[PDB]
């Protein structure tokens, strides 16, 4: 969370196992796997999601639990970023060429 240092809210992060659709309500999300992340204590949270490999596949969804509480800011723009990396053990097999560059041209 990259908002101001007087902004406080609460978000409910959620994870759905593979082979199950995304939650359709915050009530639905809550009954799944969820981590209530309080912004105003923690400025970051790390979820480590097991069991990825390659549709069917999980979902990550973030939901308001409360609306953000402004100090007195007149534009209520607050932001959050997200970062990603492989965790611990990982494995790959069988080299092949990338799809994002197409031929020569010079």
């Amino acid at each position: 969370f990259c908002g101001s240092a007087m902004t406080t809210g609460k978000f409910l992060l959620s994870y759905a196992p593979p082979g199950a659709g995304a939650p359709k309500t915050r009530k639905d999300a809550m009954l799944g796997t969820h981590v209530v992340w309080d912004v105003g204590l923690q400025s970051s949270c790390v979820l480590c999601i097991p069991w990825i490999s390659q549709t069917n596949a999980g979902f990550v969804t973030c939901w308001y639990q409360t609306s953000v509480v402004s100090p007195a800011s007149n534009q209520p723009k607050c932001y959050m970023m997200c970062m990603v990396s492989a965790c611990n053990d990982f494995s790959v097999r069988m080299l092949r060429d990338t799809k994002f560059i197409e031929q020569t041209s010079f």
């Binding site: 007087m6 209530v36 992340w37 309080d38 639990q65 609306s67 509480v69 100090p71």
Partner: protein
């Protein structure tokens, strides 16, 4: 400095110090009485946080209340066990907490009243189910006496029971006073005449939140502060449903 309690499949972050008030100084237990040879009962995966919908607190709001265990009747697996068992018991852990700046003010009372019995709006009617419960949605008190077809005689300053509202601190209670606190915890054990009874038919206690000194705010700032409650069963049991026989 905080720690995050987790009951598995749910997590909530709490302030490190906030005190717990154990109601009557006894924790939830499993009963250990014998003579359950003719009425054996099994103990469980319901022991997780359930977070009810947040309510606004705004200047001049009069209060709220919910009734357990009939406020958790639609919640998860715990709602299924009011329907596949004829008898039950269960203590509770209740965290009430809220946001706030340092420019807000006011204080509220949090109290759990075992066996709160409500009046009726007219003094010869009888209150019905739909006016004394609202499921997992908060009910509310009202200032200014008004009639209703059934209704609870809410008034705030009688508390719907015809007693002084200033004397409700005899029951397990915590003050949440902005400028210090912003959270409270009450752990409430099972209190009833009989050891187990039907979940639907009876209510055990009524959580209530009554503002005394009302919300107000300095220049700028939000015009409401949200309140949230979170309730987790502890040490629950339900009647058996297995034959003691054989072929």
């Amino acid at each position: 400095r905080v720690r995050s309690i987790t009951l598995g499949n749910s997590t909530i972050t709490t302030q490190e110090c906030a005190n717990v008030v154990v109601g009557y100084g006894e924790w939830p237990e499993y009963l250990s009485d014998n003579e359950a040879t003719a009425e054996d009962q099994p103990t469980v995966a319901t022991c997780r946080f359930y977070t009810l919908d947040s309510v606004q607190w705004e200047n001049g709001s009069p209060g709220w209340w919910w009734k357990f265990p009939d406020a958790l009747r639609d919640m998860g697996l715990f709602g299924q066990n009011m329907y596949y068992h004829y008898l039950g018991r269960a203590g509770y852990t209740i965290h009430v907490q809220c946001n706030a700046s340092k420019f807000h003010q006011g204080c509220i009372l949090v109290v759990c009243v075992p066996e709160a019995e409500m009046g009726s709006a007219q003094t010869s009617g009888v209150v019905n189910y739909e006016h004394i419960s609202k499921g997992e949605i908060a009910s509310r008190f009202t200032t200014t006496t008004t009639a209703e077809d059934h209704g609870v005689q809410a008034a705030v300053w009688n508390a719907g029971m015809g007693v002084g509202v200033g004397n409700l601190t005899i029951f397990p209670h915590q003050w949440i006073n902005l400028r210090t606190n912003n959270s409270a915890t009450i752990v409430m054990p099972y209190v009833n005449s009989v050891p187990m009874d039907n979940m639907y038919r009876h209510h055990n206690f009524t959580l209530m939140i009554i503002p005394f000194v009302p919300l107000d705010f300095s220049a700028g700032a939000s015009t409401y502060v949200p309140i949230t409650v979170t309730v987790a069963p502890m040490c629950a049991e339900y009647n058996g449903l297995r034959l003691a026989g054989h072929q």
